[PDB]
Symmetry: C3
């Protein structure tokens, strides 16, 4: 899975090790191994969420197979909100998630694509 987190928290207010703890959280929530989880955190951005510049975070989750229905994404959403509200000390009104299904022909790995691996 690919997780990308944009936040207007400065880098020195993002907890040390967040990118590693998010790998372990995503592994349990999405049912994929932690060594196949990829996390990108982009702090110190200028953001408005719901029209407000108070601290906030945007998470994008992309994966093959597991983020492609409302019923699956409702479950994933509940668990990611619990994790992030605690780690970032944000209210649930200050986080949004987007889910993007991927197919194997879209993922370039070790000089080929996943269709052939």
């Amino acid at each position: 899975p690919f997780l990308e987190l944009d936040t207007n928290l400065p880098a020195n207010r993002v907890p040390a090790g967040l990118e590693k703890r998010l790998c372990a959280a995503a592994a349990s929530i999405l049912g994929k191994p932690a060594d196949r989880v990829n996390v990108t955190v982009r702090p110190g951005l200028a953001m408005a969420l719901s029209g407000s510049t108070e601290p906030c975070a945007q998470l994008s989750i992309s994966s093959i197979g597991v983020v492609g229905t409302a019923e699956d994404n409702r479950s994933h959403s509940a668990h990611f909100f619990e994790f992030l509200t605690k780690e970032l000390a944000l209210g649930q009104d200050r986080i949004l998630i987007r889910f993007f299904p991927l197919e194997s022909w879209q993922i370039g790995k070790i000089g080929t694509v996943m269709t052939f691996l």
Copy 2:
């Protein structure tokens, strides 16, 4: 709507309050309330646009319903170019926009997805 702006302008050359003025602009252009507009600005990046590293900006716009046809996106494009060329003091050759339709099962909000709200 979700608006993401990448620019090679340094943070101290991006006008103060741009993320808030872009909420109000997007509200009028896309016909959605300003309190449902989300803006992310990422300044100080290394960019080439049309092969050139002169100051430039990339805007991504994602929304349910309203960015899914050529005729709608032509109108949105004209209005966003007018707003951004003035705010950033860039020529129209230095801006590109990408439009991405979303569906309600893709948006995680308050621990669920929008399909159920």
Copy 3:
């Protein structure tokens, strides 16, 4: 084409001129002119790739027509991995690519969309 590169290398460890050399590389690999290539590099991020925070890079490639099959993307992947492993001095285990097809109604250029140009 649109190329977006996220890396946990600090800005002062990314080779000067990478955004320009990536325009020339993408032109040859994707068969589009260098003056239609757009590159965004975001350095200094907090990243884990395959569960590890060692130096790594994520590349996203979006284009009309040329990134929409496994056979095309296998070729593109091989060439981009050769370019990036040398430029960033990373192993092939530390890079992933995502490919995204676009349609002309999604691209805002000079105040319209590409459908009308």
